[PDB]
């Protein structure tokens, strides 16, 4: 670095130099031992800079995992007595930093002067700003579902259709597709009630303040109906609404779980508690789950196994690994074993070097379930980082190993690994998209679906088109879901296949000669393609430059809907709104419009079925692909403190 340090100051300035060094270092450096050395040296030149840059001082700090350093840097922006650059950099920190990291900064600031920091770190205003953003512009088509209602039967499509509309209102809280018609809702029962009630949670996600009383409709003393599943789903509902945010719910959920009735509601509590307190590693919750998990009932193992991982996510705790793997060597029940497939895998997250001991122990295990559970470990142990060793082992298992489920999971794990380089990602699945084994094909379709979901890659869709007509019924389901993710919020901007795909969905839902499971992916795909009224998107990466923990964990769980349909609700976590928001000095959101520099057709909504200055107010959405084609009117009294090239909350500066 000494020759690097000397090059920090040179005959040339730092316009792009030292700006492309960071971009290059992140995308090429493999070993972390050297990555940290080069990074913190990259924080040095900013600190000594005459007008130090602060937008990216924290962004480059989060990787190093230095909770204290950010605290002092933030305070030096209060003693200096400017709330502008010390305010904006606080919102980006919340969006892209780990909760343990974020929780590790408040206590420095904490230990109404104390209100300004604490509030801006939880993001509650952002959620409210997000919630206000969603409700402000919601364009969902009643006919789009209406054309699906006529195809609804007494089959699983009913519970598939309830899942579909929930995605179209992820946070909008417009529960009127489910309120205009109810007698149809009472058609499916004895497991849909848990799934349907879950669909309520996703719709109301972010409505934290008015949360408990909205679940109050399902209290024992209020109605007390003949089914306990509907009340159980309320515990599940809290998790979906309160995703990645546990306040008083942790006390509430613990209170409900402490008293245990028949374990048909204890499934929701374990999942609901896990969603409420994901990635926190609180010993209090961990202990309670064990006593529930050790009850050794199949209907409760899946909730316990998955939940146990969620709470202790990214912990590499020795006791948790011993207990989780220990229980998955003597439980005769299989459903609990299934839940531990992701529970142990989740616990080891973003490690890439500490999973070697467990990966060798799991991938070599005799039990078929544990073999795949190890595959997910490598899937998350090396998330994003396109490690060659991980793919090498993964590819060998995906071709030579015996059990089909382990092979299916092996190919799906590829997407998590090569997602940082979407273009190349289809290079490893081209030959595997037509393998002899239908199961390998399904993973291939989902390998692209979760790998390059954000981008509408041309080659990716060309691969999925031929596989959309495969004779294998379930392989067809995987094909459709891949397309829905890949062309999310795409309107003729990526390729002209967006128009055709929607009509392809209809023909497969309107036909009476298609496999009941085959149309399940189609109906669910239609909802995914229009997630949250087109105002949400799925992207495992954040605009700042950090991988989105909730999205990766959620999407991995969503792919696990072969074994538990109601478990297929963990896709709201991966939903991230695509919007740019301007704010006042402290809290006000002004009323300004920023125009675009492209044709209006590209930005246009699908609309129910030549200007170059597209107008959009402050609470306006711009897709990340076209987020760079916007115009900020300099003639306005407000100016953007952040560059208007990477979206999200922006503290607009008045002039």
């Amino acid at each position: 670095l000494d020759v690097f340090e000397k090059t920090i100051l040179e005959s040339n300035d730092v316009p792009g130099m030292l700006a492309y060094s960071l971009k290059l270092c992140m995308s090429l450096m493999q070993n972390k031992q050297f990555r940290n050395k080069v990074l913190r040296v990259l924080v040095k030149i900013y600190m000594n800079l005459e007008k130090p840059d602060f937008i990216n001082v924290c962004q480059c700090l989060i990787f190093l995992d230095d909770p204290q350093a950010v605290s002092d840097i933030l305070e030096k922006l209060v003693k200096e007595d400017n709330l502008l650059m010390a305010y904006q950099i606080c919102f980006d920190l919340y969006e892209s930093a780990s909760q343990q990291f974020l929780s590790s900064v408040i206590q420095n600031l904490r230990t109404d002067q104390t209100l300004k920091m604490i509030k801006i770190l939880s993001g509650e205003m952002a959620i409210e700003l997000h919630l206000q953003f969603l409700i402000r512009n919601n364009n969902t088509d009643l006919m789009i579902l209406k054309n699906t209602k006529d195809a609804v039967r007494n089959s699983v499509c009913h519970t598939a259709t309830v899942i579909a509309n929930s995605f179209m209102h992820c946070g909008t809280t417009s529960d009127q597709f489910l309120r205009d018609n109810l007698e149809w809702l009472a058609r499916a029962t004895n497991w849909a009630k848990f799934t349907a009630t879950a669909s309520l949670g996703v719709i109301h996600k972010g409505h934290e303040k008015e949360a408990l009383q909205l679940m109050a409709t399902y209290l024992p003393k209020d109605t007390s109906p003949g089914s306990a599943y509907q009340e159980g789903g309320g515990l599940y509902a809290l998790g979906l609404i309160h995703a990645n945010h546990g306040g008083d719910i942790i006390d509430y959920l613990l209170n409900q779980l402490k008293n245990a009735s028949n374990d048909i509601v204890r499934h929701g509590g374990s999942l609901g508690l896990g969603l409420a307190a994901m990635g926190t590693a609180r010993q209090d919750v961990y202990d309670l789950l064990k006593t529930n998990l050790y009850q050794d009932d199949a209907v409760t193992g899946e909730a316990a196994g998955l939940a146990l991982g969620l709470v202790m996510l990214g912990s590499k705790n020795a006791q948790a690994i011993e207990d989780m793997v220990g229980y998955a060597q003597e439980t005769q029940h299989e459903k609990i074993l299934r839940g531990l497939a992701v529970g142990i895998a989740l616990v080891m997250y973003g490690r890439m070097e500490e999973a070697d001991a467990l990966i060798e122990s799991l991938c070599r295990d005799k039990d078929p379930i544990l073999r795949r559970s190890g595959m997910y470990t490598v899937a998350m142990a090396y998330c994003g980082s396109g490690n060659n060793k991980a793919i090498r082992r993964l590819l060998h298992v995906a071709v030579s190993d015996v059990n089909d489920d382990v092979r299916r999971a092996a190919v799906e794990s590829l997407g998590f690994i090569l997602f940082r380089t979407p273009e190349q990602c289809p290079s490893v699945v081209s030959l595997l998209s037509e393998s002899y084994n239908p199961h390998v094909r399904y993973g291939a379709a989902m390998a692209l679906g979760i790998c390059c979901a954000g981008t509408g890659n041309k080659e990716a869709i060309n691969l999925l088109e031929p596989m959309t007509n495969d004779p294998v019924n379930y392989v067809r389901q995987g094909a459709l879901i891949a397309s829905a993710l890949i062309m999310i919020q795409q309107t003729e901007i990526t390729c002209p296949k967006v128009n055709q795909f929607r009509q392809l969905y209809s023909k497969v839902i309107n036909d009476k000669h298609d496999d009941v499971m085959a149309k399940f992916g189609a109906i669910l795909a239609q909802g995914i393609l229009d997630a949250g009224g087109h105002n949400v998107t799925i992207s495992l990466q954040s605009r700042t430059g950090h991988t989105h923990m909730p999205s990766v964990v959620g999407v991995l769980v969503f792919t696990q809907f072969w074994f538990w349909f109601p478990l297929s609700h963990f896709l709201s976590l991966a939903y991230t709104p695509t919007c740019v928001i301007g704010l006042n000095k402290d809290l006000k959101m002004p009323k300004v419009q920023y125009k675009s520099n492209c044709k209006p057709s590209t930005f246009a909504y699908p609309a129910p079925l030549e200007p170059n200055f597209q107008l959009l107010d402050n609470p306006a959405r711009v897709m990340p692909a076209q987020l760079k084609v916007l115009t900020m009117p300099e003639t306005c009294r407000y100016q953007p403190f952040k560059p208007l090239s990477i979206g999200g909350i922006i503290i607009l500066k008045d002039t």
Partner: protein
């Protein structure tokens, strides 16, 4: 610029060697 190419290809070569182990590993399994 050039460093973006020397080390960009280095990944590609270390990639083509991984597809040489998967393709030649499925041959021993496909034939079976």
């Amino acid at each position: 610029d050039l460093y973006s190419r020397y080390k960009k290809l280095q990944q590609e070569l270390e990639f083509l060697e991984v597809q040489e182990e998967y393709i030649k590993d499925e041959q021993k399994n496909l034939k079976k």
